[PDB]
mmCIF file with all atom_site columns, C-alpha atoms in Angstrom:
data_model
loop_
_atom_site.group_PDB
_atom_site.id
_atom_site.type_symbol
_atom_site.label_atom_id
_atom_site.label_alt_id
_atom_site.label_comp_id
_atom_site.label_asym_id
_atom_site.label_entity_id
_atom_site.label_seq_id
_atom_site.pdbx_PDB_ins_code
_atom_site.Cartn_x
_atom_site.Cartn_y
_atom_site.Cartn_z
_atom_site.occupancy
_atom_site.B_iso_or_equiv
_atom_site.pdbx_formal_charge
_atom_site.auth_seq_id
_atom_site.auth_comp_id
_atom_site.auth_asym_id
_atom_site.auth_atom_id
_atom_site.pdbx_PDB_model_num
ATOM 1   C CA . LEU L 1 1   ? -12.243 -110.727 -42.395 1.00 55.01 ? 1   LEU L CA 1
ATOM 2   C CA . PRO L 1 2   ? -9.621  -111.087 -45.154 1.00 52.17 ? 2   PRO L CA 1
ATOM 3   C CA . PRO L 1 3   ? -6.537  -113.260 -44.526 1.00 55.33 ? 3   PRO L CA 1
ATOM 4   C CA . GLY L 1 4   ? -4.502  -112.074 -41.555 1.00 55.97 ? 4   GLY L CA 1
ATOM 5   C CA . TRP L 1 5   ? -6.836  -109.325 -40.306 1.00 59.28 ? 5   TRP L CA 1
ATOM 6   C CA . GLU L 1 6   ? -8.081  -109.010 -36.715 1.00 61.56 ? 6   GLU L CA 1
ATOM 7   C CA . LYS L 1 7   ? -10.151 -106.470 -34.794 1.00 60.84 ? 7   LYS L CA 1
ATOM 8   C CA . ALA L 1 8   ? -8.546  -104.526 -31.942 1.00 62.50 ? 8   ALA L CA 1
ATOM 9   C CA . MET L 1 9   ? -9.296  -101.517 -29.748 1.00 66.60 ? 9   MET L CA 1
ATOM 10  C CA . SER L 1 10  ? -7.161  -98.382  -29.815 1.00 67.10 ? 10  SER L CA 1
ATOM 11  C CA . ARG L 1 11  ? -5.347  -97.819  -26.535 1.00 69.74 ? 11  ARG L CA 1
ATOM 12  C CA . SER L 1 12  ? -5.554  -94.017  -26.634 1.00 69.78 ? 12  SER L CA 1
ATOM 13  C CA . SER L 1 13  ? -9.025  -93.450  -28.124 1.00 71.40 ? 13  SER L CA 1
ATOM 14  C CA . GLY L 1 14  ? -10.891 -96.687  -27.462 1.00 68.39 ? 14  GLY L CA 1
ATOM 15  C CA . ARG L 1 15  ? -12.016 -96.808  -31.091 1.00 68.79 ? 15  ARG L CA 1
ATOM 16  C CA . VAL L 1 16  ? -12.023 -100.141 -32.913 1.00 67.47 ? 16  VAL L CA 1
ATOM 17  C CA . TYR L 1 17  ? -9.356  -100.613 -35.584 1.00 68.98 ? 17  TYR L CA 1
ATOM 18  C CA . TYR L 1 18  ? -8.000  -103.424 -37.736 1.00 69.89 ? 18  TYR L CA 1
ATOM 19  C CA . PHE L 1 19  ? -4.559  -105.049 -37.653 1.00 70.95 ? 19  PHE L CA 1
ATOM 20  C CA . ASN L 1 20  ? -2.979  -107.578 -40.044 1.00 70.21 ? 20  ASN L CA 1
ATOM 21  C CA . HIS L 1 21  ? -0.449  -109.793 -38.300 1.00 71.89 ? 21  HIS L CA 1
ATOM 22  C CA . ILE L 1 22  ? 1.107   -110.947 -41.592 1.00 70.00 ? 22  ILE L CA 1
ATOM 23  C CA . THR L 1 23  ? 1.793   -107.510 -43.068 1.00 69.02 ? 23  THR L CA 1
ATOM 24  C CA . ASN L 1 24  ? 1.783   -105.615 -39.732 1.00 72.50 ? 24  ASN L CA 1
ATOM 25  C CA . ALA L 1 25  ? -0.582  -103.138 -41.380 1.00 72.88 ? 25  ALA L CA 1
ATOM 26  C CA . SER L 1 26  ? -3.076  -101.244 -39.238 1.00 73.74 ? 26  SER L CA 1
ATOM 27  C CA . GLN L 1 27  ? -5.999  -99.021  -40.195 1.00 73.27 ? 27  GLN L CA 1
ATOM 28  C CA . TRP L 1 28  ? -9.296  -97.672  -38.858 1.00 72.55 ? 28  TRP L CA 1
ATOM 29  C CA . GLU L 1 29  ? -11.383 -98.773  -41.844 1.00 75.09 ? 29  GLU L CA 1
ATOM 30  C CA . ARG L 1 30  ? -12.734 -102.317 -42.082 1.00 73.06 ? 30  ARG L CA 1
ATOM 31  C CA . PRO L 1 31  ? -10.568 -104.110 -44.664 1.00 73.24 ? 31  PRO L CA 1
ATOM 32  C CA . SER L 1 32  ? -12.010 -105.402 -47.935 1.00 69.50 ? 32  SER L CA 1
ATOM 33  C CA . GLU L 1 33  ? -4.416  -115.505 -54.363 1.00 68.61 ? 33  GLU L CA 1
ATOM 34  C CA . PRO L 1 34  ? -2.626  -114.322 -57.514 1.00 67.67 ? 34  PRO L CA 1
ATOM 35  C CA . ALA L 1 35  ? 0.215   -116.330 -58.997 1.00 67.64 ? 35  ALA L CA 1
ATOM 36  C CA . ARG L 1 36  ? 2.461   -113.248 -58.959 1.00 72.24 ? 36  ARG L CA 1
ATOM 37  C CA . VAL L 1 37  ? 2.556   -109.824 -57.335 1.00 72.29 ? 37  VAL L CA 1
ATOM 38  C CA . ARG L 1 38  ? 4.693   -106.776 -58.006 1.00 72.54 ? 38  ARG L CA 1
ATOM 39  C CA . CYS L 1 39  ? 6.070   -104.836 -55.042 1.00 70.18 ? 39  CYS L CA 1
ATOM 40  C CA . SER L 1 40  ? 8.318   -101.956 -54.136 1.00 67.74 ? 40  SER L CA 1
ATOM 41  C CA . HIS L 1 41  ? 10.067  -101.754 -50.809 1.00 69.07 ? 41  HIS L CA 1
ATOM 42  C CA . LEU L 1 42  ? 12.119  -99.498  -48.561 1.00 70.49 ? 42  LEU L CA 1
ATOM 43  C CA . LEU L 1 43  ? 14.704  -101.360 -46.488 1.00 73.24 ? 43  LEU L CA 1
ATOM 44  C CA . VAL L 1 44  ? 16.384  -99.977  -43.371 1.00 72.66 ? 44  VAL L CA 1
ATOM 45  C CA . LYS L 1 45  ? 19.342  -102.105 -42.352 1.00 71.81 ? 45  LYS L CA 1
ATOM 46  C CA . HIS L 1 46  ? 20.824  -102.416 -38.876 1.00 70.75 ? 46  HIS L CA 1
ATOM 47  C CA . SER L 1 47  ? 23.949  -103.769 -37.230 1.00 68.21 ? 47  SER L CA 1
ATOM 48  C CA . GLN L 1 48  ? 22.561  -107.336 -37.226 1.00 68.36 ? 48  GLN L CA 1
ATOM 49  C CA . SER L 1 49  ? 21.573  -107.385 -40.918 1.00 66.07 ? 49  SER L CA 1
ATOM 50  C CA . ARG L 1 50  ? 23.070  -110.305 -42.844 1.00 64.37 ? 50  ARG L CA 1
ATOM 51  C CA . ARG L 1 51  ? 25.205  -107.782 -44.768 1.00 64.12 ? 51  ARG L CA 1
ATOM 52  C CA . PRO L 1 52  ? 25.396  -104.592 -42.635 1.00 61.60 ? 52  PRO L CA 1
ATOM 53  C CA . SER L 1 53  ? 26.382  -102.432 -45.609 1.00 63.08 ? 53  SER L CA 1
ATOM 54  C CA . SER L 1 54  ? 24.572  -100.532 -48.338 1.00 61.11 ? 54  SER L CA 1
ATOM 55  C CA . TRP L 1 55  ? 25.103  -97.905  -51.010 1.00 64.09 ? 55  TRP L CA 1
ATOM 56  C CA . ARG L 1 56  ? 24.275  -95.370  -48.281 1.00 64.57 ? 56  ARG L CA 1
ATOM 57  C CA . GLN L 1 57  ? 26.835  -96.552  -45.729 1.00 62.35 ? 57  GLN L CA 1
ATOM 58  C CA . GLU L 1 58  ? 29.843  -98.862  -45.942 1.00 62.80 ? 58  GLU L CA 1
ATOM 59  C CA . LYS L 1 59  ? 29.344  -99.942  -42.316 1.00 59.79 ? 59  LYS L CA 1
ATOM 60  C CA . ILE L 1 60  ? 25.790  -99.820  -40.998 1.00 59.77 ? 60  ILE L CA 1
ATOM 61  C CA . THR L 1 61  ? 25.945  -99.313  -37.242 1.00 60.36 ? 61  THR L CA 1
ATOM 62  C CA . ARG L 1 62  ? 22.413  -98.350  -36.184 1.00 52.54 ? 62  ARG L CA 1
ATOM 63  C CA . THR L 1 63  ? 20.682  -100.698 -33.764 1.00 55.43 ? 63  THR L CA 1
ATOM 64  C CA . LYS L 1 64  ? 17.666  -102.764 -34.738 1.00 52.22 ? 64  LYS L CA 1
ATOM 65  C CA . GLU L 1 65  ? 15.620  -100.518 -32.440 1.00 53.44 ? 65  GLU L CA 1
ATOM 66  C CA . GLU L 1 66  ? 16.925  -97.408  -34.217 1.00 54.28 ? 66  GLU L CA 1
ATOM 67  C CA . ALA L 1 67  ? 16.083  -98.956  -37.579 1.00 54.99 ? 67  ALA L CA 1
ATOM 68  C CA . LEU L 1 68  ? 12.525  -99.632  -36.443 1.00 53.70 ? 68  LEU L CA 1
ATOM 69  C CA . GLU L 1 69  ? 12.131  -96.017  -35.331 1.00 48.79 ? 69  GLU L CA 1
ATOM 70  C CA . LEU L 1 70  ? 13.292  -94.866  -38.782 1.00 52.65 ? 70  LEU L CA 1
ATOM 71  C CA . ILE L 1 71  ? 10.796  -97.214  -40.451 1.00 51.81 ? 71  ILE L CA 1
ATOM 72  C CA . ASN L 1 72  ? 8.010   -95.953  -38.184 1.00 50.94 ? 72  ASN L CA 1
ATOM 73  C CA . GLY L 1 73  ? 8.793   -92.358  -39.115 1.00 52.76 ? 73  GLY L CA 1
ATOM 74  C CA . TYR L 1 74  ? 8.768   -93.113  -42.832 1.00 52.05 ? 74  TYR L CA 1
ATOM 75  C CA . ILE L 1 75  ? 5.412   -94.867  -42.480 1.00 54.72 ? 75  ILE L CA 1
ATOM 76  C CA . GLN L 1 76  ? 4.052   -91.817  -40.648 1.00 50.14 ? 76  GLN L CA 1
ATOM 77  C CA . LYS L 1 77  ? 5.165   -89.446  -43.391 1.00 49.92 ? 77  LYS L CA 1
ATOM 78  C CA . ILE L 1 78  ? 3.850   -91.707  -46.156 1.00 47.96 ? 78  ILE L CA 1
ATOM 79  C CA . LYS L 1 79  ? 0.458   -92.057  -44.468 1.00 48.55 ? 79  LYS L CA 1
ATOM 80  C CA . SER L 1 80  ? 0.169   -88.302  -43.833 1.00 49.26 ? 80  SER L CA 1
ATOM 81  C CA . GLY L 1 81  ? 1.048   -87.558  -47.450 1.00 48.32 ? 81  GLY L CA 1
ATOM 82  C CA . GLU L 1 82  ? 4.003   -85.403  -46.387 1.00 48.95 ? 82  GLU L CA 1
ATOM 83  C CA . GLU L 1 83  ? 6.241   -87.702  -48.466 1.00 46.78 ? 83  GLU L CA 1
ATOM 84  C CA . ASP L 1 84  ? 5.467   -90.406  -50.947 1.00 45.42 ? 84  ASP L CA 1
ATOM 85  C CA . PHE L 1 85  ? 6.791   -93.925  -50.743 1.00 45.31 ? 85  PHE L CA 1
ATOM 86  C CA . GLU L 1 86  ? 8.870   -93.755  -53.930 1.00 44.54 ? 86  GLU L CA 1
ATOM 87  C CA . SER L 1 87  ? 10.666  -90.570  -52.901 1.00 44.30 ? 87  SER L CA 1
ATOM 88  C CA . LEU L 1 88  ? 11.642  -92.007  -49.513 1.00 45.03 ? 88  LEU L CA 1
ATOM 89  C CA . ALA L 1 89  ? 12.706  -95.310  -51.042 1.00 45.70 ? 89  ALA L CA 1
ATOM 90  C CA . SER L 1 90  ? 14.869  -93.484  -53.589 1.00 45.10 ? 90  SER L CA 1
ATOM 91  C CA . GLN L 1 91  ? 16.572  -91.461  -50.864 1.00 45.03 ? 91  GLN L CA 1
ATOM 92  C CA . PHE L 1 92  ? 16.795  -93.831  -47.912 1.00 44.91 ? 92  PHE L CA 1
ATOM 93  C CA . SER L 1 93  ? 16.364  -97.507  -48.802 1.00 45.68 ? 93  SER L CA 1
ATOM 94  C CA . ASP L 1 94  ? 19.507  -99.474  -47.861 1.00 46.34 ? 94  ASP L CA 1
ATOM 95  C CA . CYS L 1 95  ? 19.192  -101.417 -51.086 1.00 49.13 ? 95  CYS L CA 1
ATOM 96  C CA . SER L 1 96  ? 20.320  -101.132 -54.694 1.00 48.99 ? 96  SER L CA 1
ATOM 97  C CA . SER L 1 97  ? 16.621  -101.035 -55.620 1.00 49.97 ? 97  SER L CA 1
ATOM 98  C CA . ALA L 1 98  ? 16.557  -97.445  -54.302 1.00 52.06 ? 98  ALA L CA 1
ATOM 99  C CA . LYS L 1 99  ? 17.687  -96.383  -57.777 1.00 48.99 ? 99  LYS L CA 1
ATOM 100 C CA . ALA L 1 100 ? 14.441  -97.928  -59.107 1.00 48.46 ? 100 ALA L CA 1
ATOM 101 C CA . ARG L 1 101 ? 12.317  -96.107  -56.489 1.00 49.02 ? 101 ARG L CA 1
ATOM 102 C CA . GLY L 1 102 ? 12.174  -99.389  -54.568 1.00 48.10 ? 102 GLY L CA 1
ATOM 103 C CA . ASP L 1 103 ? 10.662  -101.487 -57.360 1.00 49.97 ? 103 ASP L CA 1
ATOM 104 C CA . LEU L 1 104 ? 11.515  -105.200 -57.184 1.00 47.59 ? 104 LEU L CA 1
ATOM 105 C CA . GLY L 1 105 ? 9.462   -106.256 -60.197 1.00 46.26 ? 105 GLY L CA 1
ATOM 106 C CA . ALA L 1 106 ? 7.035   -109.156 -60.207 1.00 42.87 ? 106 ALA L CA 1
ATOM 107 C CA . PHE L 1 107 ? 7.632   -112.416 -58.360 1.00 41.05 ? 107 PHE L CA 1
ATOM 108 C CA . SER L 1 108 ? 5.778   -115.581 -57.422 1.00 40.63 ? 108 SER L CA 1
ATOM 109 C CA . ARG L 1 109 ? 5.869   -117.587 -54.227 1.00 37.60 ? 109 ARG L CA 1
ATOM 110 C CA . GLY L 1 110 ? 9.119   -119.433 -53.656 1.00 35.08 ? 110 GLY L CA 1
ATOM 111 C CA . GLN L 1 111 ? 11.474  -116.634 -54.749 1.00 35.08 ? 111 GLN L CA 1
ATOM 112 C CA . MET L 1 112 ? 11.754  -114.106 -51.869 1.00 33.03 ? 112 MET L CA 1
ATOM 113 C CA . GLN L 1 113 ? 12.531  -114.484 -48.165 1.00 32.11 ? 113 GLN L CA 1
ATOM 114 C CA . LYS L 1 114 ? 9.505   -115.930 -46.396 1.00 34.19 ? 114 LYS L CA 1
ATOM 115 C CA . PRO L 1 115 ? 8.421   -112.965 -44.199 1.00 35.94 ? 115 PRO L CA 1
ATOM 116 C CA . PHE L 1 116 ? 8.687   -110.704 -47.228 1.00 32.19 ? 116 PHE L CA 1
ATOM 117 C CA . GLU L 1 117 ? 6.813   -113.133 -49.495 1.00 32.52 ? 117 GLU L CA 1
ATOM 118 C CA . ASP L 1 118 ? 4.012   -113.711 -46.980 1.00 35.60 ? 118 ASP L CA 1
ATOM 119 C CA . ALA L 1 119 ? 3.492   -110.005 -46.436 1.00 31.05 ? 119 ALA L CA 1
ATOM 120 C CA . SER L 1 120 ? 3.617   -109.284 -50.173 1.00 30.64 ? 120 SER L CA 1
ATOM 121 C CA . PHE L 1 121 ? 0.917   -111.821 -51.041 1.00 26.10 ? 121 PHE L CA 1
ATOM 122 C CA . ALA L 1 122 ? -1.307  -110.739 -48.120 1.00 24.44 ? 122 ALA L CA 1
ATOM 123 C CA . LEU L 1 123 ? -1.415  -107.143 -49.356 1.00 21.79 ? 123 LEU L CA 1
ATOM 124 C CA . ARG L 1 124 ? -4.106  -105.949 -51.714 1.00 20.04 ? 124 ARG L CA 1
ATOM 125 C CA . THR L 1 125 ? -3.086  -104.041 -54.826 1.00 20.37 ? 125 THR L CA 1
ATOM 126 C CA . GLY L 1 126 ? -2.083  -100.538 -53.764 1.00 24.29 ? 126 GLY L CA 1
ATOM 127 C CA . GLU L 1 127 ? -1.779  -101.469 -50.079 1.00 23.42 ? 127 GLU L CA 1
ATOM 128 C CA . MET L 1 128 ? 1.299   -100.884 -47.908 1.00 20.21 ? 128 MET L CA 1
ATOM 129 C CA . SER L 1 129 ? 2.666   -103.034 -45.111 1.00 17.07 ? 129 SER L CA 1
ATOM 130 C CA . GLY L 1 130 ? 3.833   -102.132 -41.660 1.00 16.62 ? 130 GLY L CA 1
ATOM 131 C CA . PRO L 1 131 ? 7.380   -103.021 -40.619 1.00 16.85 ? 131 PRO L CA 1
ATOM 132 C CA . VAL L 1 132 ? 8.311   -106.414 -42.081 1.00 13.76 ? 132 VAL L CA 1
ATOM 133 C CA . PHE L 1 133 ? 11.408  -108.088 -40.600 1.00 11.71 ? 133 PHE L CA 1
ATOM 134 C CA . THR L 1 134 ? 13.864  -110.256 -42.539 1.00 14.17 ? 134 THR L CA 1
ATOM 135 C CA . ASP L 1 135 ? 17.504  -111.188 -42.115 1.00 12.29 ? 135 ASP L CA 1
ATOM 136 C CA . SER L 1 136 ? 18.235  -108.167 -44.338 1.00 14.64 ? 136 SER L CA 1
ATOM 137 C CA . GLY L 1 137 ? 16.632  -105.674 -41.990 1.00 15.53 ? 137 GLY L CA 1
ATOM 138 C CA . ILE L 1 138 ? 13.250  -103.993 -41.720 1.00 16.51 ? 138 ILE L CA 1
ATOM 139 C CA . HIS L 1 139 ? 11.113  -103.391 -44.823 1.00 16.30 ? 139 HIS L CA 1
ATOM 140 C CA . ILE L 1 140 ? 8.129   -101.284 -45.786 1.00 19.48 ? 140 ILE L CA 1
ATOM 141 C CA . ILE L 1 141 ? 6.391   -103.052 -48.675 1.00 15.79 ? 141 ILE L CA 1
ATOM 142 C CA . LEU L 1 142 ? 4.103   -101.489 -51.300 1.00 17.17 ? 142 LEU L CA 1
ATOM 143 C CA . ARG L 1 143 ? 2.150   -103.883 -53.500 1.00 16.55 ? 143 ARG L CA 1
ATOM 144 C CA . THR L 1 144 ? 1.814   -102.213 -56.895 1.00 16.29 ? 144 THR L CA 1
ATOM 145 C CA . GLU L 1 145 ? 0.387   -105.060 -59.017 1.00 18.73 ? 145 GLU L CA 1
#
């Protein structure tokens, strides 16, 4: 299994699935290092974020638990195809990168916060993370290159 992936059993259906503890990605299908990757992200901040403020809200008051529920709902809509990642990032990311549809550009190791970096480099091109936690808040990460 690729780096970070483990086999688990679904609690509701009993079907095997795969989980990546680095990216917090999960999927039914069996899954299958570059100097630099390019990623987009969608950040939801919460009251304990290092700077609890964004272009969306001067004072961010939602709890960390409420932020996770928002992230979970965005992931659901992205995976169902009801929304695409870029449209949600443009509307709802608590980050100036929302204006760039979440794009952060390319980066190598040693430049981003560690949980974000580790998840970014564990994704395959085109793959999306689950909720990734940093001092900024909770991220959904899309590796684009």
